[PDB]
Design a protein around this ligand. Structure first.
Ligand SMILES: Oc1ccc(-n2ccnc2)cc1
Ligand SMILES: Oc1ccc(-n2ccnc2)cc1
Ligand SMILES: [Mn+2]
Ligand SMILES: [Mn+2]
Ligand SMILES: [Mn+2]
Ligand SMILES: [Mn+2]
Length: 201
């Protein structure tokens, strides 16, 4: 089939808020989304997975974690996750340092993606086009915080998480895996997938 552009793919399959945040992330670290286009799509994907991971999860009036998929959560509900990803470096560390001074949770060396108020820990979300065990070890060796929980998703449905503790229910993680499957399929229809996959390196 015809080779599409990754720019068109990103603009057509990601929400404009997500695309704008990814452009900002790349600008912040001196990269151009129109040149590093596979990285651009990977950042969009990672942002979306982090938002999907936190979606619908609340802590109820008794302090227990619950799932509310309706648009209107009860007003006494607390969001279960703090989202650190998707923020500029000053604001992201402002949110982190805060949680750390507040809860007593130690400070990470690298910015994590979420904070889980149920499990009382930071989370590093990974999305890989390679094998999850390889990618898991690379991340574990990098952060080595050992209080920060790692949860890796692949595009073919495999997952790996710290201590085999997957945090979320099957249905929530299935929403994420379904979305990743969709991204891969749509990229493949545009003849973008093979190169995107091989670019992770
Ligand atoms: O090549 C890049 C650029 C920016 C990135 N980023 C900064 C903040 N969040 C993602 C990651 C990778
Ligand atoms: O000004 C911003 C906004 C979002 C950013 N970001 C997106 C994903 N990770 C960080 C970076 C910079
Ligand atoms: Mn709300
Ligand atoms: Mn980021
Ligand atoms: Mn991050
Ligand atoms: Mn991450």
């Amino acid at each position: 089939g015809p080779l599409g552009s990754m720019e068109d793919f990103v603009r057509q399959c990601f929400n404009p808020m997500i695309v704008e945040l990814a452009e900002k992330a790349m600008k912040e670290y001196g990269e151009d989304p129109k040149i590093e286009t596979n990285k651009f799509a990977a950042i969009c994907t990672h942002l979306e997975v982090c938002f999907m991971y936190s979606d619908f999860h609340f802590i109820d009036e008794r302090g227990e974690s619950i799932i509310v998929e309706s648009g209107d959560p009860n007003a006494l509900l607390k969001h279960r996750f703090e989202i650190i990803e998707g923020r500029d470096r000053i604001m992201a560390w402002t949110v982190v340092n805060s949680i750390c001074n507040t809860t007593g949770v130690e400070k990470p060396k690298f910015l994590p993606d979420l904070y889980d108020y149920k499990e009382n820990r930071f989370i590093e979300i990974g999305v890989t086009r390679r094998e999850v065990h390889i990618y898991y070890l690379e991340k574990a060796n990098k952060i080595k915080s050992e209080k920060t929980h790692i949860h890796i998703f692949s595009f073919t449905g495999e997952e790996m998480a710290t201590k085999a503790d997957y945090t979320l229910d099957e249905e929530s993680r299935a929403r994420i895996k379904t979305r990743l499957f969709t991204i891969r399929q749509e990229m493949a229809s545009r003849s973008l997938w093979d190169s995107f996959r091989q670019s992770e390196r």
